[PDB]
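Input (structure):
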């Protein structure tokens, strides 16, 4: 018997387990599908980045109707630490109105103001050296970055010279320097905060900062390489879980909690635990013979990610060195690795293929001459057209509320809808942060070893292509600006300066967009039950007691930014919520 059982030892689950076990009278068992990492260089060393070491095996999408019926491999972590163990270490908060919007969907206690203290509590910022801050244009607001919390973050101690050309080009096309992208707005260019521990220039993943740091505690239990296969109930009270070996041996074990079960199994894991447990849409559960404990049509609905596009380039005059020097110049690569091994300096402090700066933009910043035409098209179109006919009416109502919030964001000069990056080598990246499209993740069987059906539904809402085409065009402005023209860039096939119309551009984007950056969210959404929600503002699953969702399944919709910083802070927040109820 334990006080709490947590299903999934990723960012959210380890953060919560750490905080709960600060009380020696509280025992927690974290059951995690994947193993402990081995401190491999591909995990700890940014320049050695090997995220494939711990991908969840055997996940594939359905044919994507919005992307020429392409099927894609599905990327998500299977390891203690979850996504933090294998992600690109990009550490960014959302914008103020993300959290304010979640509140306004009917979630008391949710706002930028209520999240800020948890962002600060989550982390310790280590400032860069003064010379690098000056040379690099690295700025921050120390008043809103944490100084005492467990997640270490800082910056690489080096930048590739081409990053200077790109910064100045971005400024030339209306992306100015941002004082601090952690301050609730990020309109322009800034250094990428990185979840690195500057004492060793190694990854600060949740395994380290929310397990190893406190692993002397006897009340903090971990069971790697096991799957939570089912929640156990006494009436409507969640009292325990069943678990099985991840490797598929015909063993099943029950373990019980005295206070609560917490799901932390991620956007693609949490809904499957709920549905196998009889918490989910009665149509699906009836088809599979699963007895209904709580009829929640929102479970597995509302899937979101943040699509990506890689644009290939050739250069007549690129500057040396650059990220591609690591792969095409054995001498350079060896010298940089030796430099890192000796004094922890140089290119190996940057995640492999990343540069050091990035840019974020609102819809009006991307599309100053046409954003009102995009907003009009989106306003004109019934929210129901984005979902299959016969979608549960409560789920449609919640989608319409999300959509109305996002259209306000499209009007807001201080909320981002897209990200631009250049690694300094042969490609650029353009990310779509705020899709209106919604996907699904549903079990196909009662067998807990079976992958769910994963349908991103990328590009099914036609507004998304209008936003994404605008982001593409802004990226093209950067590469055509004076400070980048000196390097002699040109788009390579299948892009090219000869694609000038929205139709010509998007035809290629439809063939190249990746549905996912492994940012899967929002499949157990925090909205009122009558809006298709799965959890309350206190993250309690509707219709049962003693059961919460901690992982980013609970988010209503995607942020202006990537999820990691908010995955940590939301778990810090929930730990205090749980402590308040049980007087811990
Ligand atoms: C390769 C890659 C790259 C990036 C990113 C991810 C990935 C995989 N992300 C996304 C970010 O890392 C991600 O959104 C968060 O880790 C989500 O945290 P959660 O706690 O929701 O899930 P998370 O995925 O962290 O943890 C879920 C855990 O549950 C486990 N699990 C699932 N089913 C289970 C079951 N039935 N029983 C037990 N355990 C189960 C999984 O094994 C996993 O460890 C990212 N974000 C960002 O901000 N910056 C970035 O640079 C990147 N880059
Ligand atoms: C560094 C760039 N980058 C990513 N690369 N992903 C990579 S790199 C990579 C190389 C190999 S290889 O070595 O076999 O070729 C295989 C798979 C890889 N993957 C797939 C996971 S994921 C990401 C997210 C964010 S965000 O979260 O901030 O948006 C920002 C930047 C990101
Ligand atoms: C990562 O953050 C932690 C927490 O703020 C740092 O740990 C503190 O470090 C100081 C100086 O070494 C110690 O005196 C404190 O006792 C530590 N506190 C805790 C709670 O651990 C660590 O220093 C950080 N890494 C860097 C590079 O600053
Ligand atoms: C995708 O497949 C459907 C069949 O389900 C077909 O009707 C449609 O034409 C296909 N789309 C493309 C672009 O090939
Ligand atoms: C920093 O900003 C200044 C002023 O715009 C510019 O001259 C310089 O090239 C920039 N350097 C980098 C590395 O971004
Ligand atoms: C698992 O074990 C039980 C009890 O021995 C048995 O009834 C069942 O056939 C086994 N299943 C598999 C997949 O081997
Ligand atoms: C390879 O890198 C080395 C070490 O920095 C440098 O001296 C050399 O000029 C590079 N070679 C090419 C062809 O860029
Ligand atoms: C357009 O440019 C691309 C990119 O270099 C090239 O592949 C193609 O030859 C050009 N297209 C036509 C129709 O001439
Ligand atoms: Cl292990
Ligand atoms: Mg210093
Ligand atoms: Mg050494």
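Output (sequence):
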């Amino acid at each position: 018997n334990y006080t709490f059982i947590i299903a999934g030892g990723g960012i959210s689950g380890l953060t919560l387990a750490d905080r709960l076990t600060e009380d020696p009278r509280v025992t927690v068992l974290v059951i995690e599908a994947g193993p402990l990492d081995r401190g491999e260089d591909g995990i700890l060393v940014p320049g050695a980045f090997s995220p494939w070491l711990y991908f969840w095996p055997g996940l594939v999408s359905t044919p994507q109707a919005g992307l020429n019926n392409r099927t894609v491999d599905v990327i998500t972590a299977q390891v203690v630490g979850g996504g933090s163990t294998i992600n690109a270490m990009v550490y960014l908060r959302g914008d103020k109105d993300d959290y304010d919007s979640w509140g306004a969907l009917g979630n008391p206690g949710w706002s930028w103001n209520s999240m800020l203290p948890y962002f600060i509590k989550s982390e310790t910022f280590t400032p860069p050296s003064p010379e690098l801050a000056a040379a690099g244009n690295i700025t921050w607001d120390g008043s809103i970055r944490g100084r005492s919390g467990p997640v270490n973050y800082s910056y690489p101690n080096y930048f590739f010279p081409g990053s200077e050309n790109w910064w100045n080009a971005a400024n030339e096309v209306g992306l100015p320097p941002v004082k601090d992208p952690m301050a609730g707005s990020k309109q322009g260019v800034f250094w990428i905060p990185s979840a690195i521990d500057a004492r060793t220039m190694t990854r600060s993943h949740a395994r380290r900062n929310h397990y190893d740091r406190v692993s002397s505690r006897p009340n903090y239990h971990i069971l790697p390489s096991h799957l939570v296969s089912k929640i156990l109930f006494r009436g409507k009270q969640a009292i325990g879980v069943s678990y099985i070996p991840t490797s598929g041996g015909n063993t099943t074990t029950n373990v019980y909690a005295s206070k609560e079960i917490t799901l932390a199994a991620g956007g693609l894991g949490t809904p499957k635990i709920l549905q196998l447990s009889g918490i989910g849409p009665r149509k699906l559960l009836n088809e599979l013979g699963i007895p209904v404990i709580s009829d929640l049509p929102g479970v597995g609905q509302n899937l979101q990610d943040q699509p990506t596009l890689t644009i290939p380039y050739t250069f007549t005059n690129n500057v040396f060195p650059n990220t591609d020097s690591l792969t095409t110049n054995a001498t350079y690569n060896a010298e940089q690795r030796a430099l890192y091994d000796s004094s922890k300096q140089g290119a190996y402090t940057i995640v492999n293929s990343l540069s050091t700066n990035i840019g974020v933009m609102s819809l009006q910043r991307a599309a100053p001459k046409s954003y009102r035409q995009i907003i009009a098209a989106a306003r004109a179109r019934s929210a129901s057209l984005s979902l299959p006919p016969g979608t549960d009416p409560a789920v449609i109502r919640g989608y319409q509320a999300q959509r109305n919030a996002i259209l306000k964001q499209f009007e807001n000069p201080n909320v981002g809808v897209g990200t631009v990056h250049w690694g300094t080598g042969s490609s650029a990246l353009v990310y779509h942060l705020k899709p209106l499209s919604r996907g699904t993740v549903n079990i196909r069987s009662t067998n807990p070893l079976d992958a769910p059906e994963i349908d991103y539904r990328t590009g099914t809402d036609p507004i998304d292509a209008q936003v994404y085409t605008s982001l593409f065009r802004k990226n093209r402005e950067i590469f055509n600006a004076p400070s980048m023209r000196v390097l002699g860039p040109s788009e390579a096939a299948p892009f090219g300066a000869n694609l000038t119309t929205d139709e010509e551009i998007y035809a290629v984007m439809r063939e190249l967009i990746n549905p996912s950056n492994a940012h899967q969210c929002c499949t157990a959404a925090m909205m009122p039950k009558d809006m298709g929600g799965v959890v309350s503002s206190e993250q309690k699953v509707y219709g049962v007691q003693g059961l919460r969702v901690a992982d980013i399944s609970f988010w209503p919709f995607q942020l202006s930014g990537s999820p990691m910083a908010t995955a940590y802070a939301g778990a810090e927040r929930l730990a205090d919520v749980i402590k308040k109820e049980h007087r811990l």
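Notes: Residues 124, 126, 148, 152, 197-199 surround ligand 3 (CB under 6 Å). The radius of gyration is 23 Å.
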